[PDB]
Known about the structure:
The protein has 108 residues and is mainly alpha-helical. It has one domain. 77% of the residues lie in helices and 4% in strands. The chain is built from 4 helices and 2 strands. Strands 1-2 form a two-stranded antiparallel sheet. The radius of gyration is 14 Å and the shape is elongated. This is histidine kinase. It is found in: Cell inner membrane. It comes from Salmonella typhimurium (strain SL1344).
Amino acid sequence: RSTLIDARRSEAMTNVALEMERSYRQYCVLDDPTLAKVYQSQRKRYSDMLDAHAGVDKLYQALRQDLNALAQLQCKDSGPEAAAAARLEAFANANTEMVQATRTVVYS
């Protein structure tokens, strides 16, 4: 079932995930509504790829929850809120796990 198109998608998801965290920390510094729109656009782009990544589970469910928990931008003293920052970190590690898991199933 899984082809390298699913591998390219895991690539692109982690790329958008880091772009999400970049926009999040940029927004908390500058407090600009346009950056918020970009962040939700990137979050929406990640959501769409996760849907296309359905199948290919535990790791899938956790990625969807982190995506939902990151829906609102909470800032505190020019940085993300502590709970928001912990979610961003967890979301990035689940994405790393997703790349590993995806790459084993596309070739074994």
